[PDB]
Design a protein around this ligand. Sequence first.
Ligand SMILES: CC[C@@H](N)c1ccccc1O
Ligand SMILES: CC[C@@H](N)c1ccccc1O
Length: 330
Amino acid sequence: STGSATTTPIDSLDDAYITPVQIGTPAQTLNLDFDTGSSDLWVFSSETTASEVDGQTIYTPSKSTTAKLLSGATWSISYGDGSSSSGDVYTDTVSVGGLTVTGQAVESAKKVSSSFTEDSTIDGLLGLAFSTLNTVSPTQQKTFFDNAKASLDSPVFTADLGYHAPGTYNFGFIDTTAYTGSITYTAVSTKQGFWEWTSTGYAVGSGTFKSTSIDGIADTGTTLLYLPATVVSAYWAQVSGAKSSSSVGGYVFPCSATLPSFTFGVGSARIVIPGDYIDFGPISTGSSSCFGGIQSSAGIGINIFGDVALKAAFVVFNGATTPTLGFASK
Ligand SMILES: CC[C@@H](N)c1ccccc1O
Ligand SMILES: CC[C@@H](N)c1ccccc1O
């Protein structure tokens, strides 16, 4: 089997991407944030505290003839940005782009943090990291991809995120028309539960490539590119007037600037992020200070190849017995 679903930016800044997901019988379609940095499929629901729901579409398990309460199961998750959610668990039929999993754990939120409430465009998350990170207790549950894997034509999914445009998540096949050149594959460590890999270096604009190992994670659920402070400083030094602002929370730059590209290495291959992809717009409405798309990871503990980096590539998440990642230009 295969599946293919269009993923759409939630706003004009590509803050995140939403993909429609069918849950239950009859189907209830929710728009979920596919997140290769986590491993829970959780949704706003009829059980979510009413004051914490503000415009999201909810899953109502009582209206699904295939929903079953997973007795005794609870979940609770905290994300790298400080947001969180928790609740109980159903199993139900879940379909993405024509690919159907029966008995998928659907984690129903009883509580969500304010950032989730305040964002009406995201109805939940669909985790695509390794199932070892799943938070369901006392019996950990498998991701959608883990449940589908054995049925897929090939045990892979691909992320093809758009810049200011729609894009595609495919399951079970590699669309050879969706990229240019070849796909370069690189080793993955699953020891932390992430799609963790080592970039071979970087360049700023037309500058020389610096060969240096940068360990990080491929994370579709993170908006920006988080890299070591040395790398980030070298990038922003090429933008007149750019500076790190402690009050804003990162590097800002004059909105009148033209940003240089940023290149990262994948083996001997190179993925070029155009300068425009690094512009996150005024820090507040009407400001002439703009927030940068490349930021320091120093306060995270890991480097994160988020959407800024991934949307410059066609990315293969190869879930073979020994997982690997693939990157192609497009
Ligand atoms: C918007 C870019 C375009 N290549 C595309 C993206 C997603 C789905 C269909 C399409 O025609
Ligand atoms: C000024 C941009 C700011 N709202 C932002 C900061 C980090 C990640 C995404 C974002 O859009």
